[PDB]
Design a protein around this ligand. Structure first.
Ligand SMILES: CNC(=O)Nc1ccc(S(N)(=O)=O)cc1
Ligand SMILES: [Zn+2]
Length: 257
């Protein structure tokens, strides 16, 4: 089964998921000098005040904080998007060392981690249908650098002990994802894919320019998670990131000058 090891990592994925070598794969390097300001891009609208978090799950690849997406409670609109995209889950990708971990890079710079807030287009009715469409998902990507702690992350950090291993979940209600955002909503955007198998080319990527800061202690706790299930040999959940893929026939647009 696919993963992030030497024998099942990103360089192997194409054998089971041939779209890995497709025309709009993610992540990518964001060359800041080549991205073009697009004045026709509208401000992002992040409407999370009514978000209902439910649960946190270690799925063997990352941990997902899941939300109630049966109504328009936490939605992303505007920017490059047509229509309304409902928040279903967020998760992170991170490194074994502070110098790597992000999936997108910025002028080849790797951040310590990257947060993905995953949303699906309500015109397709459910998430499983949305991933089959070229405009099915909108993923809001936020870089993490190590410095000061992010207070709004701590409730996530402190539950990780209870979901150490693959398949474990815990109740995770009343978590406010607004506490994970940076100050500015300036962003880059481009058409891409899921960054894990099945690698479907269904994502409008919206990557914020401003990183959030998290503390060394916070990221160290991410690195205590396990890829393995309970009672299996311990393999630390680290370096669960796909490297940058060829941009091919795509333009990255900037919301800002
Ligand atoms: C239930 N399946 C599911 O959520 N798959 C999924 C979602 C998002 C991403 S990412 N890394 O591109 O944001 C990858 C896989
Ligand atoms: Zn992701």
């Amino acid at each position: 089964h696919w993963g992030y090891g030497k024998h099942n990592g990103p360089e192997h994925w194409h054998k089971d998921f041939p779209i890995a070598k497709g025309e709009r794969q993610s992540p990518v390097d964001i060359d800041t000098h080549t991205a073009k300001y697009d004045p026709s891009l509208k401000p992002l609208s992040v409407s999370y005040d009514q978000a209902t978090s439910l649960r946190i799950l270690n799925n063997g690849h990352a941990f997902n904080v899941e939300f109630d997406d049966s109504q328009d409670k936490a939605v992303l609109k505007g920017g490059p998007l047509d229509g309304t995209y409902r928040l279903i889950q967020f998760h992170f990708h991170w490194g074994s060392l502070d110098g790597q971990g992000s999936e997108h890079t910025v002028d080849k710079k790797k951040y310590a981690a990257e947060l993905h807030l995953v949303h699906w287009n309500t015109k397709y009715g459910d998430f499983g249908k949305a991933v089959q469409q070229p405009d099915g998902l909108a993923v809001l990507g936020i870089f993490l650098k190590v410095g000061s702690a992010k207070p709004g992350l701590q409730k996530v950090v402190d539950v990780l002990d209870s979901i150490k291993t693959k398949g474990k979940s815990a109740d995770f209600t009343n978590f406010d994802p607004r506490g994970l955002l940076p100050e500015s909503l300036d962003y880059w955007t481009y058409p891409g894919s899921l960054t894990t198998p099945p690698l479907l080319e269904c994502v409008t990527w919206i990557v914020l320019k401003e990183p959030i800061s998290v503390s060394s202690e916070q990221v160290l706790k991410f690195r205590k998670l396990n890829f393995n299930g309970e009672g299996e040999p311990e393999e630390l959940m680290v370096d669960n990131w796909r490297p940058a893929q060829p941009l091919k026939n795509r333009q990255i647009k900037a919301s800002f000058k």
